[PDB]
Every structure is written in C-alpha cells, then in structure tokens.
Design a protein around this ligand. Structure first.
Ligand code: HEM
Ligand code: HEM
Ligand SMILES: Cc1ccnc(CCc2cccc([C@@H](N)Cc3cc(C)cc(N)n3)c2)c1
Ligand SMILES: Cc1ccnc(CCc2cccc([C@@H](N)Cc3cc(C)cc(N)n3)c2)c1
Ligand SMILES: C[C@H](O)[C@H](O)[C@H]1CNc2nc(N)[nH]c(=O)c2N1
Ligand SMILES: C[C@H](O)[C@H](O)[C@H]1CNc2nc(N)[nH]c(=O)c2N1
Ligand SMILES: [Zn+2]
Lengths: 405, 405
C-alpha cells in the first residue's frame, strides 16, 4: 500500500509513491520496528546485470534521451562486458550522475538541498597509496577553498573479484588523536583511540595534545597500509571563542573546518567503490553538541557549566541545557568570524523542508530517517520534528562497510 | 549471537537482545520494504476467547500459579461465560493487573518506572452521566492530593454488544478553551478548538480568556452527552514565574497540575474499556516546550525572546534555543515553589534507563518508541538518545479510538 505522510504543524498530507521503487529490505518486519538501530541488521551476473540496466536507464532518463540509440547501444555494451568478464565500467559522466544520486538518496542527510552541486573527481586511474595521497591532498585544497567550502567527492578504483580493495583506513580525512591512559581515561577524542593506535604501530610519532591531527593510513590492494602526514597548511582549523563570555577562549578549544567522510562504500549500478571520500561543510550541532558534549567524546559540559557558575548538583537547574546552548553559540560565532562555512540547525532544517517539497514534485517522495534528521538539541523547535518521514533504501547508495583490519 | 533483535547503547558500548518481542501477537506499521516509526497514527467468539485465554495465562503467571487448579478453573469459567453470553467479566484483581500491564506495555511512555504504582478505581457499576461525573471528581481529588500527585486510573463499564459505549468526549480531564477569532487567530489553546465548539453547541456559556478551563462532556450508553462544569477548587493550577527574570511572572502564564488523559481505549483480554481516564504527573518539557512553544500551540517563543532582548531576526543567534530553555526552567521552578509534583527531562530519562534495565531482567525486553521517548529539547544530552529501542505492540494496551461525534 502507499504510505500517508502528515505534517502535524500544518495539517498537510502527501503520499510517498517513490517507496515502491525500493528493491531492498530495511531493518524492520510486521511484528517490530527497528528504525533506531544505527547499523542495519546483517553488514552473480544476472544480479549485476539487472542492477546495471536499471542504472543505465536512470542515467538516460536524467538527460532526456531514454529510448535513444545511445541509450540502447550503452545497454548493449554493458551487457557484452558483463557476459564476458563478469563486471563493467562506468563512463565518467555516468559516475558523476551516480555520485549525485547516492547523496540525494541518503536518508540520514539533512544537507540534501545541495545535492546537485557536487564536484566529482575521477581517481579511478590510481595505482598506489602514494597516488591516493596526492588525490586526497588535491580534494582537501579544492574543498576547503580558504573557508569558502565546496562539496566534493573523489572516487578511487572499484572493487574487483580477484583482489583486495583500495581503502582509506581513517574514518574521516581529518580526525584528532585519542591517547588511552594506563588509567582508562583518554586525552583527545575517545572516538579515535583505535585509529590512533594503528597509526603509532605503523610508525607514527605521537604527540600528546588534545587536538593532534592524525596522519592518513592509505591502502592499495593486498598491501599493508602506508602512513602519510597531511601538511599542516592544508588542514584549516577554527579556534573557538564565545561572543560575550571572555573566559570561553581560555578553554583552548578548536575544531577543523572540513568534514570529510572516508570509510563509506559508494554503490552505483552494481559496482562498489570502497574508497570514495566525500566532503561538505558542518552543521554547528555536530561540533557543538555531539563532538564536544557527548559523554563519550570530549565531554566538556561540566567545565563550561562551572565557568558559567551554574548549579551543577541538580538536574532541575537545567545546567546541561544552558551550557550546551552557549557552546553551540561559540561554534557559530567562531566559524563566522574566521569566514569558514557553517550552517546552524534552524537554517539547515528549514532548507531540508524545502528539499522534501522539491522531491515530492520531482520524484513523488524522499527517503528520510527521522531520528537522524531531527537535530540533537532543540528538536521540537525545528520544523522537521513535526514532519512524518518514510525511510527506505534506493540505489545508487552510500553504505557502511567493515573496518579493513 | 542470538535470533532476536540486537539492541545497542552507543554511549556505553553495551548490547542486549530483545526476546519479549516474541509475544507481540499483533503487527505494527512497518514492512521489509519501508520504515514507518515516525507515523503518529498507526492504521468473533473464537477471537475473544483466544485473547481472553492469553490474558488469563498472563494473570496466573504473574501470581506464579500457572498450571494450578485455580488457573484451569478460571479458563473454563471464561469459556463457559463467553459460550452462553458472547462475552465475559474480569475479577477485580485481574482488572488491577490488566490496567498496570497496559501502562507497562505503552511504548511511548517515558514514565514507566512507576508502572507498579497505579491506584485502580473500579467504576464498572456506573449507570449514568451524573455518576461518571462523581467518579471523575473523586479521581481528580485523589490524584491531585493538594500537589503531591498520585498515579490513578478509573475504569468505567466495558463495551457491550448492542448497547452504546461510555465515553468522555474531552481528550483530557483538564483542558483550556480555544476560541476561533474573526481574523482567524485563536485565543487560548489551538489544540482545543473542536472540543470548545462542541461544548458551546451543547450549551456551555463560553468565556473569552487564554486559560479558561473547559467543562466535561460525558456520555452514557445510548444518550446525548451531558455537560458538567468542574468546580474550580478541584482544578489545581500553577502560575509561572522565572527564578531570576522578574518580568516573566508579568506574562500571566499558567498551567494545570494534573495531566489526565480521557479519550483512550483500554483493552484487556479482548475486553474494551472505552472510558478509562488515567493521570500521573508532568514531565516539564510537555508544558514548557510543546504546549507553550509549539507554533500550533500557545506559540510564545518570540514574545519571550523579545523580553530577553534576543536578536530574533537571525536563526544563528540561537534565540529559539535560549528562550525555550528559560521557559522550561520557569516551569520547573514554578511547580517546585508551588509544591506540585513535576519531573525534569534529565531525571525522567535517567529513570527510564533504569526501567529498561529492570525490564531486561524481568521480561527480556521493553517496547519503546524512540522518537517519543527522546525529549523535544536537549535530546542528545539525555542518556536515551544513545540507546537503541525496539517498538512493538503487546496486550493489555492503551489504544487510540475514533472521536465519539
Ligand atoms: C553540504 C553540507 C552537508 C551537510 C550540512 C550535511 C549534513 C549532514 C548531517 C548533519 C549528517 C548527520 C551525520 C551524523 O550525525 O553523523 C549527514 C549525514 C550524511 N550526509 Fe550529509 N551533509 C552535507 C553534505 C554531504 C555530502 C557532500 C554527502 C555525500 C556526497 C553527504 C552524504 C551524507 C551521508 C551518506 C550521510 C549518512 C551517514 C550515515 O548513514 O551514518 N552529505 N549529513
Ligand atoms: C507517572 C508520571 C508519568 C509521566 C511523567 C508520563 C510521561 C509521559 C509522556 C511525556 C508521554 C509522552 C506524551 C506526549 O508527548 O504527548 C507519555 C505517553 C504515554 N503515557 Fe505516560 N507518564 C506518566 C504516567 C502515565 C500513566 C499513569 C499512564 C497510564 C496508566 C500512562 C500512559 C501513557 C500512554 C498510554 C502514553 C502514550 C500516548 C500515545 O500513544 O499517544 N503514563 N507518558
Ligand atoms: C555508525 C557509523 C559507521 C560508519 N560511518 C558512520 C558515519 C559516516 C558519516 C557520513 C556522513 C556524515 C557524517 C558526519 N558525522 C560528518 C559529516 C560529513 C559531511 C560530508 C558533512 C557533515 N556536515 N558532516 C558521518 C557512522
Ligand atoms: C493522536 C492522539 C489521540 C488520542 N490521544 C493522544 C495522546 C494521548 C496521551 C496519552 C498519554 C500521555 C499524553 C500526554 N500528552 C499527557 C500526559 C498524560 C499522563 C498520564 C502523564 C503525562 N506526564 N502526560 C497524551 C494522541
Ligand atoms: C540510537 C540512536 O538511533 C542513535 O543514538 C542516533 C540517534 N540520532 C542520530 N542522529 C544523527 N544525526 N547522528 C547520530 O549519530 C545519531 N545517533
Ligand atoms: C512526526 C513525529 O512523529 C511527531 O511530530 C512526534 C515526534 N515525537 C513526539 N514525541 C512526543 N513525546 N510527543 C509527540 O507529540 C511527538 N511528536
Ligand atoms: Zn520501522
């Protein structure tokens, strides 16, 4: 049947008909809803062939040349290549279309209003970890752009049956080290403890600060990873200050400008690209609320609350809430002052509402994961909290893959 | 591992498996193709008897007499009764057990650490609207208990073939009028425009303020609903003031102490109690964030922000967030001053985490609706944000039912 989708603030109804074009299973079945799960529950030629055709059809429809002779000849080439070789290759303009669609289709992304504006770097001619580094360095320079951040993706060579994958070991191109103490505690980012240790063990000389940038561990097929230190001028960073609380700068806090995810797999027409790092710009609550305030990250709420002189002995003073708001305010202010692109969670969710409306007219629906779209502070103050959403998997798609160690 | 849903906590790293979802004998809204967990509305003798047997088996396990001779005799008495009459009647202790189990089972309730402490008033002897009113007045006096609130449910007679239902038309026992204005705005609570107008059609003389307490519209089998005014000394209210912002008291805001939901159906062993009003106490975010700041409710955020002198022309000031926090704090402060029971969203969520642990040991799971359990401000600052949840329908249950008009 066809899901009814209601906005509770406005009373308006739509029906998602694009859901029918989904060829997958999500985590849920008749007897129990598993939507809150962060991981879905299980991480031949016919198969590949139908996924290939479907993707070729999406491409030629996108340029309004469906049924053309180009369309039919491309179907024939893909067929002939799969029948002899068990695999095929995309043309560059197909890869570009496919990367944009993968982003468009990502149900957890609030930034999708930007989906048509994505710079795609073809790095499928890469043959060594050394060459991976030069492409990664050029992507960072392009995407950073002295703070006028531009969305980008760099695509390395596809998985092939005979062989190991191209992989970037790091989860993002820029991450801070986390150093485990003999006494349990961590200095830096507890999220990166394991990658930190891998880096030491492949020969990195560690620092001892709270904000030490990690090197990259880059792996070409069936070779041990190699270590590459990013040149410090490539990594733009922003020191955090508050616009009225003078002591805030004293905390010595800072964050990197460029959020660039490097561990997800890109699937397009049945082909899998195991290294395809992509970047955009931050929404302030990622840094302000999750990276700095989560109890298992930098966990700085109590410090800020004491500096603000609040009553910490009791939850009903709403000390955590007042502190979180000021930290988010510091991130926005600080990024604005440094002229580095950032979006607050109100403007981001307003732009996502407009995206749902464009997609309803364009495609008859939009996949969206409510738990990840609604921000982690001030949920019900944003329009997306009051919006029902339907989550489903379309292809092309970004997916999780196993850590390569 | 096991064949049951894996449930992870991402803050602590801990994992459980829910085995309770096995006893869901009834499907939710989701299928393998699509997740519908943010949808708010979820659309025979042998049929009753399987539900009744199921519920009697639950009762007898709960008192540890399963397989007993008393258990077998009750099962037979229930079949005998259904057999001759089409229906059956619950013993007093079975109704008590059933009503607690329905609370315990409710996936959207964050207050369930309290489930075992529910005073059940048995009003199955009621024969008129006048008498429903007396029983509701007694329920309000008992639960309110001058500010020291006590959880309670009153159970009116069950649905019965042919004969009309008992129904309270109001959605809660205490509610504020909403009066549609000529220009098209609403004075009072816009949630309550329909019930307000029905009260007017049925002979109530309406006030014209922002916090006018509504009369109850109470319906006995096969009769026009009758109108009853609550004596105002029964309805405890709390005027709002802020602990440091002296002007906040001047806004003349207030809320009622008792949250008492009156339009849900209580289903136990296939029997349906169409009127069974229940009450607890407030979590502060319900008043402070949803009822006072939702755009479609009292919508007071801009007026507070203007009094705090905030920059309301730009989203990146975080003016919404800072005003919402102060409104929440005024709520907590004011309830505390007045000695009326209230819980903040940090205490509430921490207690719900404890409930989840208790239920893991008692029953091997707990059904929970993540989007409703995570509070509407400060989400990721509560431990429930980081906890995966499995949603499913167990019975006894509270269910929605269509409006009686
Ligand atoms: C341009 C600015 C962008 C913004 C502000 C943005 C915002 C976000 C946010 C806030 C999340 C939530 C992730 C988290 O909480 O961990 C996210 C998830 C995601 N975004 Fe974006 N996004 C942007 C660009 C991109 C780009 C360029 C791509 C790919 C081309 C992308 C693909 C995704 C994907 C795949 C996820 C899902 C991760 C998961 O499933 O775990 N987004 N986005
Ligand atoms: C003791 C204090 C209580 C607290 C703090 C509390 C808290 C809450 C809250 C915040 C919600 C979400 C409400 C909303 O967003 O509209 C809720 C839902 C609910 N609670 Fe409670 N609760 C309490 C007692 C009760 C009692 C006594 C019952 C029944 C005996 C009950 C049954 C429910 C049900 C059935 C729902 C779900 C409503 C739905 O599906 O729309 N709770 N609870
Ligand atoms: C559980 C798990 C396993 C594997 N990977 C992940 C997260 C992958 C991820 C993808 C997109 C964005 C983010 C965000 N955390 C980082 C980010 C990236 C971009 C491009 C923009 C932006 N504003 N923020 C993270 C989680
Ligand atoms: C769509 C629809 C149709 C019919 N009813 C509903 C909601 C019914 C409801 C149930 C429980 C709690 C609340 C809450 N809104 C009110 C409440 C009640 C209690 C007992 C405690 C507390 N802290 N807060 C509302 C929705
Ligand atoms: C259990 C829950 O699904 C998990 O904590 C999710 C909740 N929502 C999220 N939303 C975003 N954007 N990012 C996250 O990491 C999470 N974590
Ligand atoms: C669309 C979405 O399901 C809806 O707005 C929900 C979200 N979570 C909520 N959670 C609570 N506790 N109460 C609500 O009214 C809602 N509204
Ligand atoms: Zn689901």
């Amino acid at each position: 049947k066809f899901p009814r989708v209601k906005n509770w603030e406005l009373g308006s109804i739509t029906y998602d008909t694009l859901c029918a074009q989904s060829q997958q299973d999500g985590p849920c079945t008749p007897r129990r809803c598993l939507g809150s799960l962060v991981l879905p529950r299980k991480l031949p030629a016919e198969q590949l062939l139908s996924q290939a055709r479907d993707f070729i059809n999406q491409y030629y429809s996108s340029i309004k040349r469906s049924g053309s002779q180009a369309h039919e000849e491309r179907l024939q080439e893909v067929e002939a290549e799969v029948a002899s070789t068990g695999t095929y290759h995309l043309r560059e303009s197909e890869l570009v279309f496919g990367a944009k669609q993968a982003w468009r289709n990502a149900p957890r992304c609030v930034g999708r209003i930007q989906w048509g504006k994505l710079q795609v770097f073809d790095a499928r001619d890469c043959s060594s970890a050394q060459e991976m580094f030069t492409y990664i360095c050029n992507h960072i320079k392009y995407a950073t752009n002295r703070g006028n951040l531009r969305s980008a993706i760099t695509v390395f060579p596809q998985r092939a049956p005979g062989r190991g994958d191209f992989r970037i070991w790091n989860s993002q191109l820029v991450r801070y080290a986390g150093y485990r103490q003999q006494d349990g505690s961590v200095r830096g980012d507890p999220a990166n403890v394991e990658i930190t240790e891998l880096c030491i063990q492949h020969g990195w000389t560690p620092g001892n600060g709270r904000f030490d940038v990690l090197p990259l561990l880059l792996q070409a097929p069936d070779e041990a990873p190699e270590l590459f230190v990013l040149p410090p001028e490539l990594v733009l960073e922003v020191p955090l200050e508050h616009p009225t609380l003078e002591w805030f700068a004293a905390l010595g806090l800072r964050w990197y400008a460029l959020p660039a995810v490097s561990n997800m797999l890109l699937e397009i027409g049945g082909l899998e690209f195991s290294a395809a790092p992509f970047s955009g710009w931050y929404m302030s609550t990622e840094i302000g609320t999750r990276n700095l305030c989560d109890p298992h990250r930098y966990n700085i709420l109590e410090d800020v609350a004491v500096c603000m002189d609040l009553d910490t002995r009791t939850t009903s003073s709403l000390w955590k809430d007042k502190a979180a708001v000021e930290i988010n305010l510091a991130v926005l202010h600080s990024f604005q002052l440094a002229k580095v692109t950032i979006v607050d969670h109100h403007a981001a969710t307003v732009s996502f509402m407009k995206h749902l409306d464009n997609e309803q007219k364009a495609r008859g629906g939009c996949p969206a994961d409510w738990a990840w779209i609604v921000p982690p502070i001030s949920g019900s103050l944003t329009p997306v909290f009051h919006q029902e959403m339907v989550n489903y998997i379309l292809s092309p798609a970004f997916r999780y893959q196993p850590d390569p160690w």
